[PDB]
Design an enzyme around this catalytic site. Sequence first.
Site, PDB file in Angstrom:
ATOM      1  N   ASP A 138       1.144  -1.018  -0.144  1.00 28.12           N
ATOM      2  CA  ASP A 138       0.449  -0.289  -0.419  1.00 28.12           C
ATOM      3  C   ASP A 138       0.926   1.087   0.118  1.00 28.12           C
ATOM      4  OD1 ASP A 138      -2.925   0.977   2.044  1.00 28.12           O
ATOM      5  OD2 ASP A 138      -3.059   1.233  -0.112  1.00 28.12           O
ATOM      6  N   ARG A 142       0.200   8.797   0.291  1.00 29.14           N
ATOM      7  CA  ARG A 142      -1.233   8.983   2.361  1.00 29.14           C
ATOM      8  C   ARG A 142      -0.132   8.645   3.066  1.00 29.14           C
ATOM      9  NH1 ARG A 142      -3.550   6.387  -2.039  1.00 29.14           N
ATOM     10  NH2 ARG A 142      -4.029   4.022  -1.379  1.00 29.14           N
ATOM     11  N   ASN A 143       0.440   7.359   3.003  1.00 32.80           N
ATOM     12  CA  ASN A 143       1.064   6.503   3.957  1.00 32.80           C
ATOM     13  C   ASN A 143       2.896   6.310   3.738  1.00 32.80           C
ATOM     14  OD1 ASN A 143      -1.517   3.580   2.131  1.00 32.80           O
ATOM     15  ND2 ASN A 143      -1.538   5.354   4.360  1.00 32.80           N
ATOM     16  N   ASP A 156       2.437   1.614   8.058  1.00 34.92           N
ATOM     17  CA  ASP A 156       1.732   0.257   7.516  1.00 34.92           C
ATOM     18  C   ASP A 156       0.597   0.792   8.249  1.00 34.92           C
ATOM     19  OD1 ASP A 156       0.783  -1.828   6.793  1.00 34.92           O
ATOM     20  OD2 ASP A 156       1.876  -3.112   8.180  1.00 34.92           O
TER      21      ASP A 156
HETATM   22  C1  LIG Z   1      -2.975  12.003   4.117  1.00 34.44           C
HETATM   23  C2  LIG Z   1      -2.783  10.798   5.035  1.00 34.44           C
HETATM   24  C3  LIG Z   1      -3.855  11.255   5.993  1.00 34.44           C
HETATM   25  O1  LIG Z   1      -4.431  12.216   6.520  1.00 34.44           O
HETATM   26  N1  LIG Z   1      -3.096  10.167   7.393  1.00 34.44           N
HETATM   27  C4  LIG Z   1      -3.243   9.399   8.636  1.00 34.44           C
HETATM   28  C5  LIG Z   1      -5.030  10.584   9.178  1.00 34.44           C
HETATM   29  C6  LIG Z   1      -4.565  10.482  10.529  1.00 34.44           C
HETATM   30  C7  LIG Z   1      -3.939   9.433  11.301  1.00 34.44           C
HETATM   31  C8  LIG Z   1      -2.871   8.393  11.022  1.00 34.44           C
HETATM   32  O2  LIG Z   1      -1.779   8.233  11.694  1.00 34.44           O
HETATM   33  C9  LIG Z   1      -0.484   9.007  12.412  1.00 34.44           C
HETATM   34  N2  LIG Z   1      -0.275   9.727  12.603  1.00 34.44           N
HETATM   35  C10 LIG Z   1       0.636  10.439  12.994  1.00 34.44           C
HETATM   36  N3  LIG Z   1       0.345  11.883  12.710  1.00 34.44           N
HETATM   37  C11 LIG Z   1      -0.307  13.151  12.317  1.00 34.44           C
HETATM   38  C12 LIG Z   1      -0.393  14.405  12.755  1.00 34.44           C
HETATM   39  N4  LIG Z   1      -1.665  14.423  11.956  1.00 34.44           N
HETATM   40  N5  LIG Z   1      -2.329  13.852  11.373  1.00 34.44           N
HETATM   41  C13 LIG Z   1      -3.825  14.202  11.005  1.00 34.44           C
HETATM   42  C14 LIG Z   1      -2.120  12.587  11.737  1.00 34.44           C
HETATM   43  N6  LIG Z   1       1.634   9.760  13.060  1.00 34.44           N
HETATM   44  C15 LIG Z   1       1.574   8.046  13.264  1.00 34.44           C
HETATM   45  N7  LIG Z   1       2.078   7.924  13.090  1.00 34.44           N
HETATM   46  C16 LIG Z   1       1.723   5.989  13.108  1.00 34.44           C
HETATM   47  C17 LIG Z   1       1.183   6.367  12.250  1.00 34.44           C
HETATM   48  C18 LIG Z   1       0.473   7.961  12.990  1.00 34.44           C
HETATM   49  C19 LIG Z   1      -2.466   9.746   8.863  1.00 34.44           C
END
Ligand SMILES: *CCC(=O)Nc1cccc(Oc2nc(Nc3cnn(C)c3)nc3[nH]ccc23)c1
Length: 300
Positions: A138, A142-143, A156
């Site tokens: 994936d 976005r990831n 992931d």
């Molecule tokens: C463009 C894709 C997207 O918006 N992905 C997303 C949104 C919400 C949570 C997330 O997972 C993780 N986010 C963060 N930090 C973060 C800061 N501001 N946002 C909106 C998210 N850190 C992480 N560490 C592991 C997983 C996530 C992804």
Amino acid sequence: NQALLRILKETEFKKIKVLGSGAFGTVYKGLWIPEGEKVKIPVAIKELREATSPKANKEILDEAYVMASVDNPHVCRLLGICLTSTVQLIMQLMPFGCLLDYVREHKDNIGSQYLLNWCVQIAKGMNYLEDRRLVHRDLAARNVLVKTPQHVKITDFGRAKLLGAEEKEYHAEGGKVPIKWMALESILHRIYTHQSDVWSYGVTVWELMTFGSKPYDGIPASEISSILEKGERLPQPPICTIDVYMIMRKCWMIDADSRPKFRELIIEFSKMARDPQRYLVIQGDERMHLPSPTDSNFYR
Ligand SMILES: *CCC(=O)Nc1cccc(Oc2nc(Nc3cnn(C)c3)nc3[nH]ccc23)c1
């Protein structure tokens, strides 16, 4: 030192607010306060959705120890796990969110050095995953998440798979798939390999070079395999030199073994990142600025 999975009790962390959610479950911004350690660590907490057939705690811990051992600067690390009624994964918090949204929001100030550095970092992270026999399945802008504007990490949300020592392919089952990022063999046959990850890497690079444009915008996912078979591909981004676009096109060869290896992508993009304005042409590039720890020093 060596990355090791920590087991957390519910007393040692707190979910502060929801960041996002999906089929996988919910991700929270949180705080980790390890028992006895007198430190407070911002984290992302993923609470996984309840499955029809929940894994036994032993099964979960075995998977988690492997996940926690994934230790590379450009892959978001699992720091700990808490098993109760739910599975909660404590991850590194990436303060700036996903790279897709970041490049869309900041495109007026993103220059060639950043774009090419990000390409190098993602290739390094993927090469590390390949060394660990992990197929991501994936990869997309976005990831990829943003630790600082200068430093990104692949994440992931459940699709990644560990291959056995003698397995070269993962054979998937039914469900929703990210068609516009997928290699043809994945679309048509549910086959995933490190080389299908390379296809997705090419699409991810295209996303970055177009400052977050949607691939095949307006085109139905159901028609993608057809257009790919006709030989159609994503177009050259206006900022890309032919050299850059050719690497991207090589990622989308029908023959998976004709695609570059991640180790090769590291070398090629590293060369380009050493002389960024030779390889990407962006108006006002030399003037563009993103937040850096050296701003105070140069009065920026
Ligand atoms: C463009 C894709 C997207 O918006 N992905 C997303 C949104 C919400 C949570 C997330 O997972 C993780 N986010 C963060 N930090 C973060 C800061 N501001 N946002 C909106 C998210 N850190 C992480 N560490 C592991 C997983 C996530 C992804």
